Amino acid sequence: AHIVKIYDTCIGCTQCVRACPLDVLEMVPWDGCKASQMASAPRTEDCVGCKRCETACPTDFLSVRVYLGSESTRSMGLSY
Amino acid sequence: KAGNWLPGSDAPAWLPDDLPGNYGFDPLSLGKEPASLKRFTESEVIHGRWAMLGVAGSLAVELLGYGNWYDAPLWAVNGGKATWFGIEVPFDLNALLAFEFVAMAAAEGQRGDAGGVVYPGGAFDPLGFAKDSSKSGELKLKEIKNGRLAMVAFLGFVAQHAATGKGPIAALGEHLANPWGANFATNGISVPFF
Amino acid sequence: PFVPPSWAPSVFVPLTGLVLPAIAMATLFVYIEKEAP
Amino acid sequence: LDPQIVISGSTAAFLAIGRFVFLGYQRREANFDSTVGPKTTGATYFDDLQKNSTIFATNDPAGFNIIDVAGWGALGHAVGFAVLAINSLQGANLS
Amino acid sequence: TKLFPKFSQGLAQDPTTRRIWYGLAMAHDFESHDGMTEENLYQKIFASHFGQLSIIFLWTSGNLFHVAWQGNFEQWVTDPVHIRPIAHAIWDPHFGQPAVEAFTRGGASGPVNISTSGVYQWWYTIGMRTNQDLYVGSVFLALVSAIFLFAGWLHLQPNFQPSLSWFKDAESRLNHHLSGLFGVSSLAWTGHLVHVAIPESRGQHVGWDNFLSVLPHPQGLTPFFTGNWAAYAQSPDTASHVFGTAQGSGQAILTFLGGFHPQTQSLWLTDMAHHHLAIAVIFIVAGHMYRTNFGIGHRMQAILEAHTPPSGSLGAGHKGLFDTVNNSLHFQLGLALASVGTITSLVAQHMYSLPPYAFQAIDFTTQAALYTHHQYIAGFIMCGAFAHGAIFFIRDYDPEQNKGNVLARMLDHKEALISHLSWVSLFLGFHTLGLYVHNDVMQAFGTPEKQILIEPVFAQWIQAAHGKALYGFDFLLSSKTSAAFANGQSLWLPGWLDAINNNQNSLFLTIGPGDFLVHHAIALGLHTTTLILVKGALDARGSKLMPDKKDFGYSFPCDGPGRGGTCDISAYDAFYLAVFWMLNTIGWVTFYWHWKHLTLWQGNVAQFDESSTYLMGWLRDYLWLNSSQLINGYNPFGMNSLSVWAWTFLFGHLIYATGFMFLISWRGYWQELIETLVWAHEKTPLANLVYWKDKPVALSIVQARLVGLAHFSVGYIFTYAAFLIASTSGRFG
Amino acid sequence: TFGFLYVAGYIGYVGRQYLIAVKGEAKPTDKEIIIDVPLATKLAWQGAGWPLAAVQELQRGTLLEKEENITVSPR
Amino acid sequence: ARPTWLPGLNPPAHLKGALAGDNGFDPLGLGQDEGRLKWYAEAEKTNGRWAMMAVAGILGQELLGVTPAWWEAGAKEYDIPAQALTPIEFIVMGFLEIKRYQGFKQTGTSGFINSFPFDPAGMNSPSMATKEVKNGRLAMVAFIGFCVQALATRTQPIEGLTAHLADPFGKNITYYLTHLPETLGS
């Protein structure tokens, strides 16, 4: 399973959640930004490591980071 | 301040004013660190004192007709015996190194443990010239100025001999014979394009 | 005493080039595939 | 050259200066190794191999123990044979 | 889950074939294993080193055994000039009769390979004369191999495992290795030369059976204990001495002749005896420098802490470096590979020009192989030296503990370092390539007098300082009135000057404009390879494109297509790109060495002088001209002894070209292709009964770069090895 | 050697002068793809004295940027 | 405050004086693990015991007129062929030594075959243990003296002593080390 971390520079644009092609991320309430919402990664066991979320994050440096880790059938994206 | 090495210049701050022989000469700011300057202050005096002995010795040998400073140790090579003022000495090179190494180690080692003393006085000033400690300013200035002059002179001995091969007294006689035709501009060595 | 027999290559070359590799590959293939208790 | 005079003579000089000249200086520099601290702090056999288990005490007033005698004597022997060997090269045929 | 690999649960849980590949590739990265501790890390490494030592002595034993069993050493020693050494016998059932006859040579019973490693000249020089001498050495080294293997087992046992602090006793290890490992070993080797090697070179047999009753010198130890050490340098071997015989021999065991033995064209044994005696004294003395349990010596931490320039030019200086070096194995390994890698180059440079083994010079194939062998190994070791320096920064570097010291300040001005290496590489490439192309155009248009030939005056001036009188500089050793010439005129200059002014040997070969261009191409290779490796290390911890690269490790595929694309952004990839430039650099070095020597060995040095100034000459007169015999090893009319090198030559081109596939085409194409193969197997009747246990997948992004680089390197090496040996051996051998 | 350096410094100095000149404009990027020929010709002729101008910038300390005004990566 | 090898040197802590012959001599601190010191103490005796027999054997063989010199005994041919001697020695010594080790592990003392300690005559006490070590150490030093004196002088032990006694100042290590050609040229 890969590791996905959300850092406190998130502005709650939701672009990472929309970009993710496996519904790994979601938005949750927060008080640390104007949007009052923060990205969350509750389902990292389904993450494949495409890093589409990082491509979509506007903040600099990124507020969502993916660290490729142990491989499995789900993370290796196999249908066989 | 003993003067100004470059008239119109500003003396470096890190050079204390009362330091003997202070002309404000430090283009490369080598004495900027106080700890380094303290070591340099001692080394200049020791270098000058050895240079004064060396220049006096080098001139004395040739003035009395015993050769030049450069030829003095040739006896230990060819196979001859040492001579001092024409008086034969019974030692050989390997023996001489023994006395000098032990003797100089004792003296220099004793000086080294003093932790930077450069004006001991006491037994080293039997006649009490600097016993006053208040009028010593001129004597310290006279010592360093003659010391710096001797250091420059000895470099002249080495540099001149490497170019012409003659002794310091012989070189002086040759300059006076033809001042315009016998100088560093006529070596054929010092200035390659002359 | 040291000199090996004149027939040594005939036995050792096939042994180290065809036989031991076969056993080594079989040993390694079984080992990697083996499942933990 | 006579080996007995040269080797013994050089050794005496190096022992004499070591005992009377550089003993104070040498000891001070040895304490600069104390500022860093001990090598290890352990109680295993391999950790014990890095400690001064045996302290070489001496009755000499200045503390010139046997380890110092070996150090300064070795330099004298090394210098002594350098002098003898170099002097031997004089009057050597085809060498 | 699967058992293999036992050291990583992440790999063992992987259901794909990546588990097999990655398990092999992470076996020796002990720091990454599950449950690893620092103390266990050092004990595993200590055990592994015993295994490496046992392999080295077993490999050496195998060489000794096969030469004695199947070689012609006893025949070769009689007439080394006109006999080709035999490496080992051939038993290939695939051979046809013409092949069996072709490889039968040297009076051997059957087919054999000709040796190129020079072990014959080496072993003959050190006193070996019979096959039984080699047999006893082979059994002795096989025993030594066993002992080291046992020691590796012993020190893994409960009561013999050293503690962590034992591996970090720097002062004690340096004292022993300098005085004992270096000093005593060199002192012992002097004993062999005085007692065995030198007498054997004078026709007197000395073995274990009689060496206690044979006097190495007529005056036995009286000169040694009396200080009259000059007695050992009297009556050296005369210029008429015939090696291995007592005619023309002398009596001296320690000399400083300084030249080459006239017959063997190699260094005198009495000089190599005095050499090893001299450094042994220095190394034994140097090994009494550091602190131990006896209250004298230096502590390395004190030395580093002291050396801080008072002006603050180097910041904190070397403060904190002792822990940085003493606690990081990658820092220590980087210093070991950098030092050993440079010394490997030095061995190659000095062995071809100062051949130490009798009759080594006349064996042209051996000399070519030995120089190429060690230069390629040096090149790989240098790349490893920088790789582990890059690994140190990611894994072991601690910014807080290195605050303001020299190491930290290197990262402060890394852009300045990289920018200037970039400028030097560009400058050398532009002008080096430009001058070659200019000279090529002039040759093409038929005006060889219009080309730009720059005389290597600076290098020719160095050769004058060493006594080469061809250039007329009359400088230092080239002038008979200089003090340098006079002082050494009684010790080694007569022999040295005689050898350096002999133009038939490789001691300071004459150089010209052709050597000017090639040397500047070599500089381009060194600077560019350093640029790639140095960037990979200084940027390992992060960069503007990836500020937090340290959090991902030394080797990762990429950071994805975002931010413009980040392919080959890790420090692992900088090393991967630098290997190509290392091969390119060592290739230029070995082409230059080989071509300049082939022309010398044929006597027509003018060919190199004229054709080496433009790049068509290299392609025409070196690569194309010298391939004629190689590619005729087998042809439609038959085959000869070179057919193995002809076959290996194409074998290299194939492995090299196969590497392009892993480097050009990347993973995404192949993973999708494998998915139709998985579909095809499952739907095929009579085959879907059989099934796999590891799900097939394409190689990883990082794996294919290594696999492609491995094929590239292997094909690189095998192609030139076959050409180097075939061109040199067929021409003369 | 000194023939080439004069021309090489001429080309480099002229380009640096033009690059500084357009940095003050509202849209520097559009002044680089579309060259301001009247300005370029003016700077082309004044470059003949680049060695004099280059040295005077060095002594006045305006040749190099300050270390604090240059971006660098984390270290 | 027992006597120590160096005047005015307090013995190191790991040496308590319990062992026989404990003079506090361990400049390298080799014996500091209690598990190794016990092994070394046994190892000291066995090396000394073999040395004591060896020194007596060399002296006894020389005093009884046996030839050739002790360093040429192997070359001489005896009733049993040299090839047959080694297998006999290997089997016999292997048996004695293996049982020698087995008893030491169980009891921690030294013995013979199945008896540990092997003291049939009942002579055993701290004084006897001390006397064994001191005589053992002397034999170990003595044997090395024989080996080196054979190398340099090439004379048997008693033969060398007689030459020294006859001409003390003329004959000594100084003479032999500077006359190897003469002595080895005979």
Ligand code: CLA
């Ligand atoms: C205690 C035993 C012992 C005794 C009684 C003797 C007695 C004698 N030896 Mg022998 N010898 C010994 C030990 C002994 N040796 C050892 C251990 C060695 C090896 C270094 C030698 C090597 C040797 C040679 C090479 C020669 C003699 C010779 C002689 C004779 C003249 C004396 C001489 O030159 O001595 C001076 C030189 C010596 C080496 C003797 C040293 C004796 C002391 C007591 C040894 C102390 C060892 C010490 C405790 C070890 C500490 C180790 C440390 C790491 C802690 C004389 C009969 C000469 C002769 O004429 O022989 C026929 C001769 O040529 N001996």
Ligand code: CLA
């Ligand atoms: C060191 C490795 C090695 C060895 C020893 C051999 C040996 C042989 N190869 Mg080669 N081969 C090898 C590697 C090797 N190969 C590799 C790596 C490849 C792939 C690149 C090939 C590809 C290859 C091909 C394509 C062919 C050979 C063939 C041969 C035979 C050539 C001589 C002949 O006329 O045989 C004649 C053979 C016989 C008279 C019979 C020999 C004994 C047979 C093969 C086995 C008997 C087994 C026994 C009855 C029961 C088990 C006994 C066992 C448990 C001890 C011979 C058996 C040729 C051949 O004939 O193969 C059969 C052949 O066509 N090889």
Ligand code: CLA
């Ligand atoms: C005198 C005591 C001594 C000795 C002999 C050694 C010896 C060795 N130690 Mg060390 N070691 C010592 C004390 C000693 N150690 C102490 C006191 C400690 C504790 C502080 C250690 C702790 C220690 C560790 C932790 C390790 C070692 C290791 C090693 C081995 C290094 C590899 C090797 O073989 O290099 C051999 C090197 C040379 C012979 C010299 C190489 C350099 C020269 C200049 C090259 C050129 C020479 C010449 C021209 C070549 C000719 C070639 C020929 C073909 C012609 C080596 C066997 C390592 C090892 O492998 O352990 C198994 C290891 O891991 N040691």
Ligand code: CLA
């Ligand atoms: C004595 C020196 C030394 C030592 C002790 C180590 C030790 C280590 N290195 Mg280092 N390294 C060295 C030399 C050394 N290196 C050199 C010389 C280079 C330059 C080439 C490198 C380059 C290097 C890199 C780039 C990396 C390491 C890494 C490592 C670690 C893991 C190694 C591993 O898992 O390999 C496993 C071994 C393999 C997968 C196979 C190795 C064999 C290769 C692929 C070539 C095979 C060729 C083949 C035999 C040819 C067949 C020919 C055909 C005709 C038959 C380990 C701590 C890795 C690490 O984790 O660092 C933190 C890492 O990234 N090293």
Ligand code: CLA
């Ligand atoms: C023959 C093949 C080749 C060539 C010519 C180069 C050239 C270069 N490489 Mg590259 N490289 C190669 C293969 C090659 N590489 C391979 C196989 C790899 C493995 C992936 C790499 C990996 C690599 C790395 C990792 C690095 C380089 C670097 C460099 C530069 C080194 C400095 C230099 O020589 O500057 C002088 C420049 C040249 C010789 C380039 C050719 C110039 C031509 C002749 C100009 C022609 C102009 C003319 C007007 C015609 C134009 C026509 C057109 C408009 C139609 C240079 C641009 C380093 C770099 O960029 O340093 C700054 C660097 O870091 N290379």
Ligand SMILES: CC1=C(/C=C/C(C)=C/C=C/C(C)=C/C=C/C=C(C)/C=C/C=C(C)/C=C/C2=C(C)CCCC2(C)C)C(C)(C)CCC1
């Ligand atoms: C008691 C006393 C005293 C006396 C003392 C003495 C007398 C001493 C001595 C001492 C000594 C007398 C010492 C010695 C030492 C020595 C040594 C320590 C040595 C070493 C050596 C070496 C190390 C060597 C080496 C080498 C070799 C081997 C070879 C060649 C090279 C060389 C040389 C390097 C007095 C009166 C003063 C005071 C009071 C008390």
Ligand SMILES: CC1=C(/C=C/C(C)=C/C=C/C(C)=C/C=C/C=C(C)/C=C/C=C(C)/C=C/C2=C(C)CCCC2(C)C)C(C)(C)CCC1
């Ligand atoms: C990145 C990194 C790293 C790495 C590094 C490296 C890899 C390096 C290398 C380096 C090198 C590889 C270097 C080299 C150098 C060299 C030198 C510096 C030399 C010198 C020489 C000399 C000085 C000489 C002289 C002389 C002559 C010339 C002649 C005569 C004689 C004489 C001696 C006088 C490390 C690990 C640290 C870690 C951190 C990071």
Ligand SMILES: CCCCCCCCCCCCO[C@H]1O[C@H](CO)[C@@H](O[C@H]2O[C@H](CO)[C@@H](O)[C@H](O)[C@H]2O)[C@H](O)[C@H]1O
């Ligand atoms: C032909 C002419 C050749 C002349 C060669 C001269 C060689 C000089 C070798 C000196 C070796 C070191 O010896 C010298 O070390 C220290 C000075 O550096 C002195 O020792 C002192 O030095 C420190 C630094 O100044 C002081 O803070 C301390 O009080 C003390 O450590 C020693 O008392 C002296 O003996």
